[PDB]
UniProtKB/TrEMBL annotation:
<feature type="domain" description="tRNA-guanine(15) transglycosylase-like">
    <location>
        <begin position="152"/>
        <end position="276"/>
    </location>
</feature>
<dbReference type="InterPro" id="IPR036511">
    <property type="entry name" value="TGT-like_sf"/>
</dbReference>
<dbReference type="GO" id="GO:0006400">
    <property type="term" value="P:tRNA modification"/>
</dbReference>
<dbReference type="InterPro" id="IPR002616">
    <property type="entry name" value="tRNA_ribo_trans-like"/>
</dbReference>
<dbReference type="Pfam" id="PF01702">
    <property type="entry name" value="TGT"/>
</dbReference>
<dbReference type="InterPro" id="IPR053537">
    <property type="entry name" value="DNA-guanine_TGase"/>
</dbReference>
<protein>
    <submittedName>
        <fullName>tRNA-guanine transglycosylase</fullName>
    </submittedName>
</protein>
Length: 413
């Protein structure tokens, strides 16, 4: 209750037909319909999902996004059936402001958005915002065309936040007002305004790019305005060492994919732990998806065969090591033989220590989650999307376990 965690949908599902040894799948399986979200792999890894209108409408994300078939199925069957959401979970609707950040005004009318939230049957709907990227550095003061723009987008958000509260008066979702700002004081302004209109429920927007200190100073500035009944939501944020601090400062709700993004986007610390100490995933790339190796082949540096064999030997060693049938010593040698090649020799010696730690500590054996216990050493291999996203899923469950731990603490004396 005291702090809910919502998982933002960015088509992050896994293919349960993936053969980890052979690296084939069932080619006749349909994307999304036949795939698993985290809540289909774990009992309860979040309290709900957050669905963006811009993402569902395909135009936004810039990517392997919602197809027209997926989109029709969404509305045809309802978004509960689409996501296979259990009844103990909840849903929050969003517009996907990040998708139209560089446009003049938001491209949707308020009436459309309410249409979407009503037909999706979401528990919570977030007002149609326009993001204010940028926040004043220490002893920086925005002026001129920069300040006029910030103030313009603040006015557009609050204009629309008020339209949205009014036009959504007979809807079944609880409405959430979006607060943007370029400093602590502009954020406070936005929040005062929204509460004044009659919002009980606030979304602090545009906070993802900020350091934690900047977030915590803004919240300590907003805390006086908050009431017994006021809900506060941090769009995009999940920084688990700061949970206790957010609860102090009146936050009731967070949402983020960054634990999942972190599994494959970071160089070090791909595999999180509840200790909070983390492990580097071991790079073993597909020889014919790697840019670095495409070029080495093309340039005549290695025969294609020997590449393919060094790749195999590293994958084989890893598997042997996890059946306790190969020394850590010799496992490293196979893996580093391949690293020598897709990253160069000196880079191999750099990452040796990090690898000794990951492989030696066997941290995937420690973790009780269903990914680690089902795919083993594969969770700590950085290869294709199938391993990377499963590691992501592990990170999601780890974050939610950290959150439940914090919620378990009651002050007394
Ligand atoms: Zn795990």
């Amino acid at each position: 209750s005291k702090l809910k965690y919502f998982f933002p949908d960015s088509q992050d599902f896994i293919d349960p037909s993936f053969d980890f040894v052979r690296e084939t799948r069932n080619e006749h399986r349909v994307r999304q319909r036949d795939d698993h979200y985290p809540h289909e792999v774990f009992p309860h890894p979040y309290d709900g999902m957050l669905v963006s209108k811009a993402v569902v409408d395909g135009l936004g994300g810039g990517e392997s996004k919602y197809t027209r078939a997926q989109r029709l199925r969404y509305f045809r069957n309802g978004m509960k059936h689409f996501f296979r959401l259990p009844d103990n979970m909840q849903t929050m609707g969003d517009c996907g402001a990040f998708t139209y950040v560089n446009q003049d005004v938001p491209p949707y009318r308020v009436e459309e958005v309410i249409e979407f939230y009503e037909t999706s049957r979401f528990n919570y709907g977030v007002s149609l915002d326009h993001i204010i990227f940028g926040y004043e550095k220490p002893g920086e003061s925005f002026s001129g065309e920069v300040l006029a723009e910030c103030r313009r987008r603040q006015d557009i958000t609050l204009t629309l936040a008020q339209d949205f509260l009014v036009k959504s008066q007979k809807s079944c979702f609880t409405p959430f007002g979006v607060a943007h700002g370029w400093n602590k004081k502009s954020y406070r302004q936005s929040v005062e305004a929204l509460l004044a209109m009659g919002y009980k429920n606030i979304t602090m927007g545009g906070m993802v790019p900020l350091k934690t200190a900047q977030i915590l100073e803004t919240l300590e500035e907003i805390k006086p305005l908050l009431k017994s009944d006021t809900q506060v939501h941090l769009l995009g944020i999940a920084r688990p060492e700061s949970f206790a601090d957010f609860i102090r400062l009146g936050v009731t709700s967070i949402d983020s994919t960054t634990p999942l993004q972190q599994a494959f986007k970071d160089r070090k610390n791909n595999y999180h732990t509840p200790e909070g100490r983390a492990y580097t995933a071991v790079r073993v790339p597909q020889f014919d998806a790697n840019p670095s190796l495409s070029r080495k082949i093309k340039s005549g540096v290695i025969d294609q065969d020997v590449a393919r064999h060094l790749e195999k030997d590293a994958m084989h060693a890893l598997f042997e090591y996890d059946n306790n049938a190969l020394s850590l010593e010799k496992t490293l040698e196979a893996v580093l033989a391949y690293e020598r090649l897709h990253s160069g020799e000196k880079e191999a010696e750099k990452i040796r220590a990090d690898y000794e730690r990951t492989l030696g500590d066997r941290p995937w054996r420690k973790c009780e989650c269903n990914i680690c216990r089902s795919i083993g050493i594969n969770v700590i291999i950085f290869r294709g999307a199938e391993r990377n996203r499963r590691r992501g899923f592990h990170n999601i469950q780890v974050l939610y376990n950290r959150l439940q731990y914090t919620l378990s603490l009651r002050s007394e004396d």
